[PDB]
Structure formats: structure tokens, C-alpha cells
Amino acid sequence: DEIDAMALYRAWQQLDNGSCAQIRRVSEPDELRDIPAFYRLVQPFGWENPRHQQALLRMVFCLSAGKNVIRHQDKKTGISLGRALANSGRINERRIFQLIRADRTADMVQLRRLLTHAEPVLDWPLMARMLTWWGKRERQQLLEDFVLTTNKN
Amino acid sequence: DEIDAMALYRAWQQLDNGSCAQIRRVSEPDELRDIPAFYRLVQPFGWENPRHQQALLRMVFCLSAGKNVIRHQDKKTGISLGRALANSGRINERRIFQLIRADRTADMVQLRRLLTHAEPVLDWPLMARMLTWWGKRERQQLLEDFVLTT
Amino acid sequence: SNFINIHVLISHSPSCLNRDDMNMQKDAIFGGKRRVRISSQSLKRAMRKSGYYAQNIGESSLRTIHLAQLRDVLRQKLGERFDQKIIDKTLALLSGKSVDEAEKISADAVTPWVVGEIAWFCEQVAKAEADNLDDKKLLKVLKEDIAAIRVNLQQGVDIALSGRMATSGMMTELGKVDGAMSIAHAITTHQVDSDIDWFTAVDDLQEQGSAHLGTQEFSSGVFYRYANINLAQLQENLGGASREQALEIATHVVHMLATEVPGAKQRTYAAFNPADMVMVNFSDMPLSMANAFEKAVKAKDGFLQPSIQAFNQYWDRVANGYGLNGAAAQFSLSVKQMPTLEQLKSWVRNNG
Amino acid sequence: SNFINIHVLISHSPSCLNRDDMNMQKDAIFGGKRRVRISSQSLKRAMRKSGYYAQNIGESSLRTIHLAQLRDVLRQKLGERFDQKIIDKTLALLSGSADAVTPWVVGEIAWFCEQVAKAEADNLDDKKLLKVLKEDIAAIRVNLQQGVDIALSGRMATSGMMTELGKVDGAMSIAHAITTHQVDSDIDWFTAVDDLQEQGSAHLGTQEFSSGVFYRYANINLAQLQENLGGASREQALEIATHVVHMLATEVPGAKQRTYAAFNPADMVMVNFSDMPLSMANAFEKAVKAKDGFLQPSIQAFNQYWDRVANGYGLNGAAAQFSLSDVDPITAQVKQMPTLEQLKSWVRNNG
Amino acid sequence: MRSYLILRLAGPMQAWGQPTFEGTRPTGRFPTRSGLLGLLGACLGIQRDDTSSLQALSESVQFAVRCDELILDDRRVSVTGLRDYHTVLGAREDYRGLKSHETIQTWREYLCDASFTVALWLTPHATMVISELEKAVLKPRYTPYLGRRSCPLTHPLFLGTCQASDPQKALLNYEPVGGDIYSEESVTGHHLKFTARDEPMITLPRQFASREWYVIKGG
DNA sequence: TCTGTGCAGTGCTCGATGTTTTATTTAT
DNA sequence: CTGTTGGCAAGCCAGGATCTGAACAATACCGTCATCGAGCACTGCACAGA
DSSP, rough: OOOOHHHHHHHHHHHHHHHHHHHTTTTTTGGGGGGGGHHHHHHGGGSHHHHHHHHHHHHHHHHHTOOSSEEOOOOOOOHHHHHHHHHHSSSHHHHHHHHTTTOOTTTHHHHHHHHHHHOOOOOOHHHHHHHHHHHHHHHHHHHHHHHHHHOOO | OOOOOOHHHHHHTTTOOOHHHHTTTTTSGGGGGGGGGHHHHHGTTTSSSSHHHHHHHHHHHHHHTOOSSSSSSOOOOOOHHHHHHHHHTOOHHHHHHHHHHHHHTTTHHHHHHHHHOOEEEHHHHHHHHHHOOOHHHHHHHHHHHHHOOO | OOOOEEEEEEEEEEEEEOTTTTTTTTTEEEEEEEEEEOOOOHHHHHHTTHHHHHHHHHHEEEEEEHHHHHHHHHHSSSTTTHHHHHHHHHHHHHHHHHOOOOOOOOOEEEEOOOOHHHHHHHHHHHHHTTTTOHHHHHHHTTTTTTTHHGGGGGGGGHHHHHBOOOOOOOOOOOOOOOOSEEEEOOOSSSSSOEEEEEEEOTTOOOSSSSSSSEEEEEEEEEEEEEEEEEEHHHHTTTTTTOHHHHHHHHHHHHHHHHOOOOTTHHHHOOOOOOOOOEEEEESOOOOOOOOSSSSSOOSSSSHHHHHHHHHHHHHHHHHHHHHHHEEEEEEEOOOOEEESHHHHHHHHTTTT | OOOOEEEEEEEEEEEOBBBBBBSBBBBEEEEEEEEEEOHHHHHHHHHHHHHHHHHHHTSSTTTTTOOTHHHHHHHHSSSSOHHHHHHHHHHHHHHHHSOOOOOOHHHHHHHHHHHHHHHHHHTTTTTHHHHHHHHHHHHHHHOOOOOOHHHHHOOOSSOOSSTTTTTTOSSSEEEEESSOOOOOEEEEEEEETTTSSSSOOOOEEEEOOOEEEEEEEEEHHHHHHHHHTOOOOOHHHHHHHHHHHHHHHHOOOOHHHHOOOOOOSSSSSEEEEEOOOOOGGGGSSSOOSSSSSSSHHHHHHHHHHHHHTTTTTTTTEEEEESSSOOOOOTTSSSSEEEEEEHHHHHHHOOO | OOOEEEEEEEEEEEEOOOOOOSSSOOOOOOOOOHHHHHHHHHHHTTTTTTTHHHHHHHEEEEEEEEEEOOOEEEEEEEEEEEEEEEEEEBBBSSSSSBBOOOOOEEEEEEEEEEEEEEEEEEOTTSSOOHHHHHHHSSOSSSOOOOSTTTTTOOOOOOEEEEESHHHHHHHSSSOOHHHHEESSOTTOOHHHEEEEEEEETTTTTTTEEEEEEEEOOOO
């Protein structure tokens, strides 16, 4: 019972310029529930199941930062979000804290801005799993990967 | 392959006051995972290898009692932790029992309280080796060393 | 049905209801997970020393190893019924020890005693030497009607329930009792990592710091209590009591198992919680429900609700798989359903 | 097939079901790791002394043996060593159309024949013979009324059996029960509060105890069972076997149960017929690791082991399984039984 | 080349006797001659009083036993000893009558994590054929066990059949190879012997004669 | 037609008794 | 039927000291060698004579 992350990534990349532009326009994830093009995209990914939809809101909202912002890559673990943000070298550690300390919906807004800023090369399905379990464990591993990668350079 | 215990001991010793204070206010070993200063401290000692992680958490959490609580002293095996706690003459035998009987995380919490009280002089690489495994055998040897000293 | 199974789920607020040699909470590994434990001997002593037992069952037995102190108690209690000489010899025959005037006379081991039972014995001893009947033959005679001895355990029911052994004296032959109640150690349905209280003792003549710093283990827990009563064995242990007498005693055990909590650390932790679920079931073979919690219960709006649910699901699995159809009733605050404990107790009193 | 294999996985709550001369739990090393053990003899006695056994085995119909009906076959069996004069004299003094006869019956009577044959030669009879053989005669008379118990469990520790044919093994063989997982036992530190002592207790002690998911194994030799029942039928033997299946699933040793009360029934029962009886203990040779308990991974490890080796080990043959759990099942070659009674009926009907 | 019958003796517990008249029941390190005969005699339907075919089995068959080390996860597991405190209630006090003791005590030793591979061949004047011994181990009449009835098998008795020059060369075909071999027939490069009193005197029940294994170490 | 004291006949529990034992003690 | 792009995301400096960590009392017993003969029991034994 898991969302096909790569399929959703492909579904977004192939999506018509008009529909995806309607989605990007959104300012916070809960507003996506008022856009018709949104359901049109996430329908073949089990939006019907209430468990999937909260994760789907997060996944699309991150995908809706741009269309070219998140360059997916393939494992040679696979690049995590924490590694990717640190790899860009544009993000400082205090902005990472402002993500993992942010409250509900505020966190996704910050993450969105971070993706736009960093334009990261990462493993998208890996990131999709993080957004599904966006918990205390994910925040903590996010900071870990960022600090270690930054410190290595 | 094995954690350089003295290098880590030195790294903790010449740590800046900020990074040191951020680590010291931790209340249990797992909370070190929230501290950026912690990751930078243990990265050159093999943290990214999962094999070393539980050991490094114990080592640093024991050190986190303070820069001046554990005094390393060179061999003349070297002074074990059990002998060192007894050498202080400050620790009741009952508290040693309670330490070696304690379960996970709680054992490290009680140990650090004992280190704070005792301020031991010991063979740190020897204690680190003990912290690496920390099996039932190591815990019984701790108690027996303490008793054989008193 | 000869067995009455009793199942209790009881939740306690933070406490330390039972601890070991180093004052740490008793525990046990079940399903690969640590459970906080309350020993069966702690449960049994809390029940036998309780007010409810005293009011509804009677006097708990006298458990001691100090015969010299016991000697003096019997002299003060059985003095107006027997002469001091007979009282001394009775204890001597039963214990196998020389009862003189020594300050310290010790039995083989700790042994439960019943005054009423000792009173019955010294009658026999008196009549024995009166009829010029020696001790070797006195024992031979008394071995012929043990039921007449067991009727005295109606004055010491906790022995009829929990048993007695002796390795010296006539008690070896006449006082062997196989308890009618079986009882498990209470264990938590879930995993517990115990809490630690860091405390101080402030000294009124010490302005700087405290005079003592210490740590004390404690935790919460939803506990499973199990016990059964062998009715036929309980009747035999009471000298041939009726089933109604055994059933009424079982009913008091049910009540105590649901309400009695050990007193340890209760003055400073006050976990005076009654059970949230009690389940009684008649059977031909004893049946424990412990394996309802072999897979440790995960919390979900507390531990109590998912524990009761796990209990119910496993009960059905066993009943459906083993085709069990003994009478059963269930009282809960969260199979015949009972709104109150009292109705549940009437049910048991009426043979289910 | 001649053998019935019985496999039980049974989970016990904290207890001390079987201990040694230091009051320590019995154990065993298996796969290099410590398993708590309940001995064969402890498990078998729990069955043999149980109420269920006394009612279904002790009070069986095939229980009684009539020396009268056995006269013919005994007359020809012992007819080459003894002549009908002694054989019939013996047969009558022991009691005061049978096809076959139980081996120990022949052998023990043959011994009595040797005694009376030597009694006539030494020229003594009346009470003198019945005085000398008083206890011996009383012994065999008791045994002649416990034929199913003897056929199933073997002779008692005191039976009065005299010959080599009188060394009667049980038709069922019970293995030592061991945990599927490694166990570090707990310790109970206890007090005994003296009602007449002010300071402290009058005794202190410790008791070792633990939980454990145990694997019980037993097999039944059908032909041996039939042969020791005077030539009973397969159906009658399968009926006895049904009781063994029931007892191995429900009977628990009484030790320490008054104070630990581990009255748990089996969560998994499986029966399979074979020509070569095999324990499936190596399903747990690599000790089972806990994953939401030990019970679920144990049943899982049992099922995966069967799927892997049953074919190559020649465990083709009738196989059925009862389970309180909904763990992913074995190969479809094993017929799933929803209740124990349905499993037992499956055994009666030869599989 | 002669024909060999290859057997596997594996189980969590085994017991192979040493001389005793005491309540202590000791085990050796590998299967006995008497124990292997009894195991075969169990697969065949031989009763304890049938001295005729009891002697026919003994004179027809000779053995070779290899000790196999348990390997687990690529790690070696050694054989360990086990002491069972084994009591008996109401045990016979005499050989006739019904008088009995309250409790008697026995001490029984087992092997743990032990496994064995047995090579079997016919003597030059044997009675039976390996073909019928193969049938016996595939479909035993009496219940087969490892020393004691409480010790079941976890692997089939039958392992295989083969033809070879010596018992060592025969056991080579069957993994695991490397364990020490004790044989009734000597092999060329080896001269060591293992003394034992495990030759059952068939004319004298439950009594044993002295004999000797030929020792063949593994590489 | 059942039953009573003598047995013969022995099933025992009774008690004193044959023998014989000890090896250690950290690390600082 | 049709929805875009570039360019850009900071630095300094700072994390404490005092002083304190318990005591008492209690850890069991039995049986799992044997010998001999005696004194004293179940226990059937027919009966003789009631």
C-alpha cells in the first residue's frame, strides 16, 4: 500500500503546461483541495484512500515548487533531501532549523522555498517516503544528512 | 576499524565553549541525534558507519558530564571504570548494583550521574572499549571490580 | 465445571507496587519485551492482610519460624481452654522441636499456623495421654481422618487456598496442604521502560544543597491478573465443605483480585485504582488468557482500551478453536455482560 | 504410513515448568544458543497422569484383556515349548477365539508356565505355589486391565513384568520440548514475612523463571500400537492417536503452576503421516528472533521450514494444521483446520 | 568395490552409552557399535528376545561413523554435553512384586548440536543384503531414535547409496566432508585405534565385549 | 449355615551401625 | 485552444558557579546407602462346633 513516487514524478513532468501552472499557483498545501487539476493528477495514485491524501498533498506541493526544480536522480542509498540541500551549498544551517521547527502547513511552505532556492539533485522516491512519514524521525535524519555533508566539505 | 578513543577524548577536550554546552545539556544519549555539534564531533570517528553509532553515543554521553569529570590516566591493563569509581570513595555499592541492573538508555543516564559524583581517574580507551560492547559480561565485571577495590 | 478462572485487567497510575533486592521494580520478559511485574506472593499477602478478607473470610494464618514466640502466643490464647503443659507438647509434636523455656526456638522453616487448628490438636493430645496413648500411635490414629483436621482450615482459609508444607514434626504427615487457588504473577500487557525519580531530601539545618540525593524507579502499567480456584480441592481442604461454601469463597477472591492492590510505595505514589475489566469463566481445564498479550499491546488512546480489545479477540480465538463452552461473564467500565461487579459476583455465587 | 508426527507450538507466560536439583530451569543448547527445556519425561507424565488420559485411555473399551478368549492362540504359541496341560493349568489359575495376542502377554504367561512346569517337577502345588507367586499373579492381573495404557505409554515404573518381552516401550515417543528462541531467564527475589518478627523477613530466596514459545514433538507407531492391543485395527489405533494430539496441545506440567499459573493452550498443532518419523526442530536451529513476540515468528519459521524440506525429506503424505493465528500458511499440500476437533476428526479418518 | 549404505544421524539431542551399572547414564562423543546395531534392529522389526536375527544382524554388518560439525551462518557450532537430572516416582524396588520407592535419582548425559554420517557395508559372509537394509531405514517398523526414545531425528535416516573402495572414500561423496571417521575396517594411511566396550554380547543380554575402532582423522 | 480363637506365615517397621572430607583468598 | 524568464539568499560574538548522594533486619528444611533380627501389624485358612 505505497504510492508510486516515480510514476507521480513522471505524471507531473508530462502534465500539460496549463494544469501544472494552476497547481504551482497555490500558496499552501490545503489549498490544493480546491483545484480541479490537482485531483486530475493524483487520481491514479489512490487519492480516494484518506491515508494517502495527506502525503499526496505534501508530495505535490513540493513538486509544485517548479517543474524543473527537483532534478530526480538514481542511486549509484540514493541522495536524501538533507544531502541534496547541503550539496547545493546555498542553504545555511539556520534555514534548515526553520524547517524542522516549523509548525503545521508552515513547514511545507518553508520546504517549498528551500527547494526553489537550492534546486536540488536527489532521489525523489526516497524524498517521497520522507514526506509520507513527515515525523520527528524524518526531521532528525534531515538535519543529520545536512550537517554531515556540509561538514565534509 | 576501531574508534580512536584518545583522539575523541582530545577532540572533546579542545571543543569550543558553544559546541560543548550544546552537547552537555542533553538528558539522554539519543538526544545527541538532535545536536549538530554532536555530528561534527564524531564524524571523523566513523559515525556514518552504523556499526559505530551506538558506541559513539555512549562514549560522548559519558564525556558530556563535563570536560573535567573524566580524567584520563595512562597505564603503568590500566585503571578500569569499576576500580576508578571505587577509588573515589564517594560511591555507595548499592548505586553500582542499580547501575549494572539498569536497562537501556537508563543505564547511561545513571552512569553519567555516577561519573559526575565520582569524577574518576581512569584509562579512558579501556572505558571506551567497555562502552563499545556493554554486554552483560561487562556490567558484571564493573560491579566486581568495584567490590574488589573496596 | 471444577475450575473458576478469573481474569483481571487493572491499570495503575505511576507507582512502584513491587520491588526487588535493589529496590527496583520487578519485571519479566514476555514476548521478548520487558513487562513490569507484581509477584503472586505479593498479591496473596495483600489479599490475606486486607480488611475485606477479615470481614468476609476471617482470620489469616499466623506465619512464623519463631516457635518460642509462638509458644507464648498460644499460652496467652489457649490458656483458659488447656493447661500450659498440653499446649507446649502440642507445638512440640507438630513442629518436631523441643518446646521448653528457651528464649529462641526455631522451626525448620517459615510455616503457617492456625490457632483454631492447634486448639483442635491439643484436645487430641490431652485425650491421648489420658487414655495412656503414646505419641507414635497417636500419629497413627490421626492419620486415619485427615478430613477432621482440615475442617479447622475454615479458620485459616488462606492455607486452604495457597497451601502448606513442613519437613519436621507431625505436620509432615498431617499438615500437607495442596492449595486450591492457582495464581500468576501480574504482568503488564505492554512493554514498559521504567521511569526514574531523581529526588532530594532538604535538611532544615543545612542551607547549602540537600542532605540526600537519590533515584527511585517507577512506572505506570495496565496489568493482567490471572487466578483459578479448584472447587473440589477447596472443599477437601476445608474438611469436606459444600460447593456453595467453596463458591462463596471464590467470589471473595474475585472481589479481592479486582480491588486489592499491594501497599508498597502507595503512601507516596497512591495508585489506588480498581480494575477496569473482570472476567470469570467456569471450565474443566484451567485456562489462562496471558497469550492475548504475548504480542505486547501497542498504545492507542492509552494502553487500557487496546488491552481489553486484545483480551476479547484472543478469548474468541481460543473459544472458537478449542470449542470451549463453559459459563462465562464479563464486567467492564470501558459472554454474559454484567453492568456491575456485584451482579458478576451473584453470578459466580450461583454456579454461573 | 505407519507413523503419526505431532508438532505443537505452545507459548507460556512467565513460569518455571521444569527444574533440576538446584531448582534451576532445565535447558539445552540448540544451534549454539540456550533454550529453556521441558523434559520428555515431565511432558509425558503430565499426559499419562492427566484426567483426560484416565478417561479416554485408562477407561478405554480395549482396556481389559481376557485370558479366556486367548486360550487358543496361546496354546499354539507356547505349544512348542509347553504342552496344553501346563498351558491350560496356568491360564486358569491366573484368571481363577482370539486371532492374535499381545507380545508381552505371551512372554509373561510363558514365564508363569515355566514356574508351574517346575512346580510339577518339584512336586508342590496347592497354596504353596499361590503363596510364592502371590504378588506375581496380582501384578499381571492388574496389567491385564490396563492394556491401552500399557500399549500407549509402556509399562509402569513398577509393573511386575518379568521377561524381555515384558519390557514394554510406549507406542508414542515424546521428545524434550525446547524453546524456539534463545532465553535469558529472569530471577525472582522473594521474601517470607514472619508475623512474629519486627525487623525484616524470616527468609529470603531466589527463583529462576521465564517465558517461552516451546516446540513439542511426538510420534506414534501405529503398527506397534495395534500389535500391543492384541491386534487392533487401524481405526482403533487412530482413535487413540486422536487423544494424544489433544493432550499434546492442552496438557501442561504442574510444576510451579500454583504460583506462576502458566495455563496456556497451544497456538499451533500439526499432524502428518510418514514412513520415517521426523522432528521439525531444525526450523528453530537458527534461533527465532522476536518480532512482535516470539510466537508469530515461530509459526512463520515452522511454516517456512516445512515448505523448504518436506519434499526432499519424504514428508509427502497426509498433513493437516490447526492454528489460532492468521500467519501466512504453509504450502497448499497441508490442509488447514479451523478447529482442533476438525483436526482430530481428520486423524480418525486416516487423514 | 563394495556397496555402501549411507545414513544420517542428526537431532538436537543424542546419547551413546558408556559402561555403567549406576544411575548415571553417560554418553560418548560419537555413536556406539551397540547403538548402531540397535538402531538398525529397530528399523527392522527385531524384538529383544529374538537372539537369532539379533545375531544375524551383528554378523552381517559393519559400520563407519563420521562426526559432522554444525555450521551456522558460516560459523562453526561445537558439540556440547548436557546433564539431565532425571527422577522417577514409584520406581520398582525389586524385580518382582509391586513394592516401590517414593523417588529415585538418575543422571543422563546428552550431546547437543551433534550430527553424524554413517557408512554401512556387508561382511564377506553376511546374511542380508544392503537392499533390504535400505528398505528398513526408509520404512522402519519400530520407532528409530538417537540413543534414547526421547531423541528424535531431524533428518531422514537414509542419505544415499554408493559403491566405493573403502569407507572413507564412500563418505567423501556426502557433505559435510572433514570430520573424523571411526571405522571397523582399517584404511591405508592410518594406524590409530579407539578402544571401546560396546560390542553387545548377544548370548548374554545387556552385556558388552571389548572392541576397537580404526581412527581416521579428517584433513 | 455362617462365624469365632488358635494357629502358620510372614510383611513389616524398629534402631544401632559398616564407612569416613581437603584442596582459597584479586589487585593495588 | 493557449500559463514565462533572470538574478539574488549575510556577517560578528557570547554557554556559569555553589553543594549535597542513607541506614536496618532477614537467605529454610526433607528424601532419593545398606545390614541384621527382633517386636508387632494385614490376611487369608480352613474349619468345629456354635
